[PDB]
Symmetry: D2
Subunit: 384 residues, 4 copies
């Protein structure tokens, strides 16, 4: 199960080099040279890596100092053949965004949040990115009267339109993707899930330039079905980038490697992702636990990629199994896929097969045969 | 704090006439004649009532029996003077809806789901209903391959589109509201939150006919901030209806009387509804606990309207207090409604005040003053 | 993976005989006679069955047909070879237990709660039962003032103290087990987790006759690690019985097939039970979903024993693998099993290897090797 | 509503001097002087303060700078009257405890965490502390095979036995209090709830010197009822200490100021604390957010004591209302205090008022009048 560059396996600069700075602890790991990150990930069969601004260039560094990091990072990508499918902007680490970036109560920092994320859009496009991600972790509140949510969404819509107007002006080959999260650090984060994010996009001035960037743990932090949420994002056709990791239950944002936590949800996710034809990157926004040294760093990195391919093979033979194909026909997934009343509204009203002469008891007495179907989905995951 | 018909308080027949039958118990109170319940809320001060079709006419009743129950029900509303603002259909009780109604795996049961809905939509217009609520409690799955999520949404859009074509072909002054729910009775219900519903509406053929009907307990079942959900629903102008009750955490849908559970979330909800000019019905989808009698089902019902009205007084006097206003201004609540960059994108880029000449240390050093503000909101809530 | 009577699998009568009644729908399947349930459970490979006070005999039946139901069941146990390891009381269902059984507010129900329970432990002794289970599904309240939970625990202690008195008086070889559950149908259930139950045991008059009966789903309704709670129960030596089912997320009690939901928690559980040599019954307290016919409830019942045995094979080969034991050496699982201060306290005070001359950074720079260890367990779980 | 030292209000050194450094951001506030915090707290009405060993005295400082940090602080407490009722050991921040303190997988660091706790014990007793808190927030793991919980509970059982032997050896009058937390920083924590801790204490060799220190937020982080959890500790008589904060829903440990979050659970807590006669310190383990400057952290701590005085005032007026006293008797809370069967087990058997002649129908038809009681509690709290 060793990965190939055509797997589109991307990471970030914040994934490893996390140092393990826990809310209740200090650092444990070494500050990873942004160059030496892209080494091992190329040596581990990955394709591409992502980054924030402050992850690549130090905060406050001037142009020719910033330019010195971009060139050192450019030679590393060209020597190892790695790409950069996505870039981001840091709007949470610095204490200036206590009340958010695009939705801050102060107007000064709101305009500073735009200039900071605009200078980065130029860097994102000049590195061959295919999507720009915006994570509004600081956009939230702890008390009620501290933020009018209608006014904050007025500013978030105004901010995204300003960005979309900028990319259309410069003609960059890019599209945005909002990464939702229900809470942390704020008591409640604005646009907390894929549904809240997808609805927000449909009001933006140029909706075709925006998508969603769901992450496994974030939606599982609200008790929601991630394979169901990805399906709604795919059904709307607004799935531009995906963060993969593991998470158990409703707790703090634990960024375990992909495969850990909800293993069944990881199975159905890779099943839906490959069956739908998603050809974007398989990004991993995970953190190796601070329990590890500089040798368990890449074991967690290679682990989430080695996992992804295992469930990919088992979910493929699950759909290719003829015995399961008949169990899906028993579950009547042959129906459900064909239209309900494609004969029209008037034809449905005149049809008594749907009302007067519809034997309600016979249809109700038919078992859906879901258990025998789900057990076959089980045995394919373990191997039997 | 006595409720009046001016407050537009409606309740519903299944609410205060609930069996008391939970998954581990039989019935405590007897069933109620729908007329008995109508006289009842009229004496307390309710303005309207809502109902499922099976709550007014019993399932499997012929024409003469379904047309003798409406007459006794019509005479009750003509006497008490109460109106029917909302109506819904029952597609979860009968064992023919184990797999669902609009997204059932069986092609024939989906049509009866629409034939039973159309018959009740046609009668809702007779009683002067102006919003028809749809709650898909059985639209979902408990295992992965048991339901194609993209195909299920393909049938729910088709379902919803043909009844929008019906109400327009009939000229009924009626729109639709979607009641979202994350789980229960199914393991994972499609369109779980109000955002997933709002994202689903703008893919329908005529999005102006359909809105969201949020309920307190449902959004709190996903760990979400309910007053944040309505603010986004009001932001899109799709708060066609609302259901008011209580919930104490991520548990089962208990549907206790409004005001109980998350008391602070009800204060912020009643503050947002009144301050936004919402004019729809304030309707309680609550179930009195099975431990009560027939004198306790209306001591709890009266507690629903009172808990609202005394919260309406504490929230009004809060935002009307002059001391909270500069306390609000100290939190820069006025600068949040101010447009970030109404000067244009070209003016924002040429303004180095928002970047190089921006002092991030001085902007980060300000105090926000949220806790002094939140304590004033705690004082008006408690009466101190 | 065919189960044998020596695996000692147990199935409740209500388990596969659940007609499918949730708070939103009617029944789906027929009523299973207690006789036919035994013969079908034994053809699949089970070892014994479980019954409630009202699952074997109907409520309010005369003592003539009471012995008939027993003798008619007493036809099917000897003629089959199945057993009855566990018996319990049905102190819910009936409206008499609106507020509870042993901790009701009315003494009317508290005394009847005990007379009904002792009436069944006489039957449990005749059937050779070894563990009598009590589940306080109705003990609690939805409001704060409705129950002085200090006086309530005084009544659970009062009721449980005399139950062990009747057992010690009749010379029965019978022990008790507490089934913890956090919520549903009550708002908050007394003794919500295993720990609260174990603590309640150490305050009763005879803590020797009382243990716990934890269910994998009841503890996961509070986000707790179920393999952790079973480990504490085994460390205290009080795991008299165990309930096996499935549940994914903090929601209503789903009672899914074993292995469904959190499969990782199911893997580390079978690994824990087989490591400590737990020789009790593998009792499955699950409910096949309402979507199944009668053929679906047995393929699901067989699936419970099916995936326990497959998890038993992977967990055994995991710890019996040579390269896994060497990873436990790198993870230092040796030292946690070694005594900390076996040399005494005064030697601990005179040892500077544990304070002054203890290298802080050289001990903090070591890697725990937890992730490479966990992927080794993941490759064994998936059979890679 | 201004508090006095008679109210025993204490605050943590880490509470108001939190600096704001969180998972997603750098520090916001300046580091406060320990001598300053006590001045500021005494002029607000507080009675005492707490401290970790690394909070009062920085890590790695000399023995000369040690008592320099201790003396000037001691001179501050006696010059203003503040005491130190509580103290605890820091066993989480330094990367040495990245696997844990008492139950670390390496023996050399297990003995180190003990030799650090006994030193702060010598100081805690010299300053006049009455309790000492041992919260093992780094006890646990994230993978299944990383921690053998049975052998880990042996190392914690061995740990507390040593420190309890040291207390009885030095002649100190000091008792321990375990502060339980479900999750964070580790995936799953050992002894996650109050019950898990209480059951762990009864196994310890000298259980008289050990109790619980429950946190309001820590218990509802698993959806548990905190007023239910305190009175089980009050039942066992092991509530040596308690922490006051706020939390809204199952998520990361917010620790808002007391009053915020579950306002109703905060009401029922001080109601039980006053009725049960709690004389321990009303300690606050809250953290004012990043948003506040220095003037807000004192207003937040001021409202901390303010919300306790408001709730205690309305809890006393609730249980002293003549109308509530009769409503509690209509709910038959008085019969909950009466013993179930004080006449003996034989009389329980021979009395058929509790069985054969018991009116099961008339007893179930009685209402508990819980809703009217809960409304009176609402009206008393909401000033009506
Ligand atoms: Mg994350
Ligand atoms: Mg509901
Ligand atoms: Mg259960
Ligand atoms: Mg059981
Ligand atoms: Mg805390």
């Amino acid at each position: 199960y060793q990965p190939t560059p055509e797997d589109r396996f991307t990471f970030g600069l914040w994934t490893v080099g996390w140092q393990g700075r826990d809310p209740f602890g200090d650092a444990t790991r070494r500050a990873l040279d942004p160059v030496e990150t892209v080494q091992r990930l190329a040596e581990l069969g990955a394709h591409g890596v992502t980054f924030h601004d402050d992850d690549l260039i130090p905060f406050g560094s001037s142009d020719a100092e910033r330019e010195a990091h971009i060139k050192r990072f450019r030679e590393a990508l060209d020597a190892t053949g790695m790409k950069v499918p996505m870039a981001t902007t840091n709007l949470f680490t610095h204490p200036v965004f206590k009340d958010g970036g695009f939705t801050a109560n102060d107007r000064d920092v709101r305009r500073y949040a735009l200039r900071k994320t605009i200078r980065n859009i130029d860097l994102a496009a000049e590195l061959g990115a295919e999507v720009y991600v915006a994570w509004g972790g600081r956009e939230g509140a702890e008390s009620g009267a501290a933020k009018d949510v209608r006014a904050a969404l007025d500013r978030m819509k105004e901010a995204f339109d300003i960005l979309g107007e900028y990319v259309t002006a410069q003609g960059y080959n890019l599209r945005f993707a909002i990464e939702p999260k229900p809470n942390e650090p704020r008591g409640d984060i604005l646009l907390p899930t894929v549904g809240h994010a997808l609805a927000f996009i449909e009001r933006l001035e140029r909706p075709e330039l925006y998508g969603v960037n769901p992450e496994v743990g974030h939606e599982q932090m609200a008790g929601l079905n991630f394979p169901h949420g990805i399906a709604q994002a795919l059904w709307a056709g607004k799935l531009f980038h995906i963060d993969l990791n593991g998470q158990s239950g409703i707790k703090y944002d634990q960024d375990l490697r992909f495969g850990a936590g909800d293993l069944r949800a990881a199975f159905w996710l890779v099943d839906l992702l490959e069956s739908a034809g998603y050809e974007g990157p398989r990004h991993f926004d995970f953190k190796p636990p601070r329990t590890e040294d500089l040798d368990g760093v890449w074991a967690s990195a290679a682990g989430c990629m080695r996992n992804y391919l295992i469930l990919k093979e088992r979910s493929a033979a699950f759909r290719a199994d003829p015995e399961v194909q008949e169990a899906l026909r028993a579950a009547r997934l042959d129906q459900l896929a064909e239209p309900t009343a494609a004969d029209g509204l008037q034809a449905l009203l005149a049809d008594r097969t749907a009302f007067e002469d519809f034997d309600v008891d016979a249809a109700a007495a038919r078992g859906m045969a879901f258990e025998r179907l789900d057990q076959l989905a089980m045995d394919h995951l373990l191997g039997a």
